[PDB]
């Protein structure tokens, strides 16, 4: 590798994406990691690890279909509108994106927002649980897993991804390019002009590859390992359709504590 004009431009693109990333996403990985590792003295979050601590934490949890799981999905998808608008605003900063066909812009985003939301949810997760209520609470992984079916199986595949994705130790500089690569995926069904999309992603992939070489000297094949994580992201999104059919076939008890219903609406 050499520091030539082309590498200089790729560093300028990584900086441009990072600055736009910071403007668009107020909840960065660094802020989440500071809370999870206790480095922030300003927002020590409450820990919800069982039904007893859940009812003691009624203070912090701040509060239309009939099925509980459907109402959870409707609510978290409504709560996720601000994230979708932030991802869409970030996409406008990707050089060449707004020049693409408008129908392709909508198609690229409507498939991409789900995978990006899961990527940023991993920043809120460690092996023990996930942050909720804007970092004011901490919901443990095993407590979620212990809830009655089908709710007990909702989040566990996401924790398994998050543990493997966080082991790559990406920072917000890395994530800014990775998010842009996800958006410019030429394989989305219904795309009209795949060629101009891949031309942009080719540029983003070069900028990502150089960023990872500069930022992670002790990671062999980090570029490849990170691209393989997109397979795990896609499978999680795909399995949400299957999760709907599990609900329509469960005639057992589907009632959930109202505080738990509110916590799930802050997830995805």
């Amino acid at each position: 590798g050499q520091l030539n004009p082309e590498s200089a431009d790729l560093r300028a693109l990584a900086k441009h994406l990072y600055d736009s990333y910071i403007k668009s996403f107020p909840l960065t990985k660094a802020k989440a990691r500071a809370i999870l590792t206790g480095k922030t003295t300003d927002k020590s979050p409450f820990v919800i690890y069982d039904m007893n601590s859940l009812m003691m934490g009624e203070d912090k949890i701040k509060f239309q279909s009939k099925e509980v799981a459907i109402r959870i999905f409707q609510g978290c998808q409504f709560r996720s509108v601000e994230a979708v608008q932030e991802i869409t605003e970030y996409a406008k900063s990707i050089p060449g994106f707004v020049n693409l066909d408008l129908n392709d812009q909508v198609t690229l985003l409507k498939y991409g927002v789900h995978e990006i939301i899961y990527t940023m949810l991993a920043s809120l997760m460690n092996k023990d649980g996930v942050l909720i209520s804007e970092g004011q609470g901490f919901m443990t992984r095993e407590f979620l897993k212990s809830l009655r079916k089908p709710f007990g199986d909702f989040m566990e595949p996401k924790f398994e991804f998050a543990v493997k994705f966080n082991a790559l130790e990406l920072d917000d500089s890395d994530l800014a390019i990775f998010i842009a690569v996800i958006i410019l995926s030429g394989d989305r069904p219904g795309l009209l002009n795949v060629k101009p999309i891949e031309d942009i992603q080719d540029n983003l992939l070069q900028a990502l590859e150089l960023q990872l070489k500069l930022n992670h000297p002790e990671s062999s094949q980090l570029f490849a390992k990170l691209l393989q994580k997109m397979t795990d992201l896609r499978q999680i999104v795909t399995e949400h359709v299957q999760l709907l059919q599990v609900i329509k076939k469960t005639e057992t008890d589907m009632s959930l504590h109202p505080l738990l219903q509110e916590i799930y609406k802050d997830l995805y």
Binding site: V84, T88, Q105, K110
Partner: peptide
């Protein structure tokens, strides 16, 4: 839900 998201995205792109 899907066209709802497409309309959210269309409005945000304006």
């Amino acid at each position: 839900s899907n066209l709802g998201l497409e309309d959210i995205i269309r409005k945000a792109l304006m």
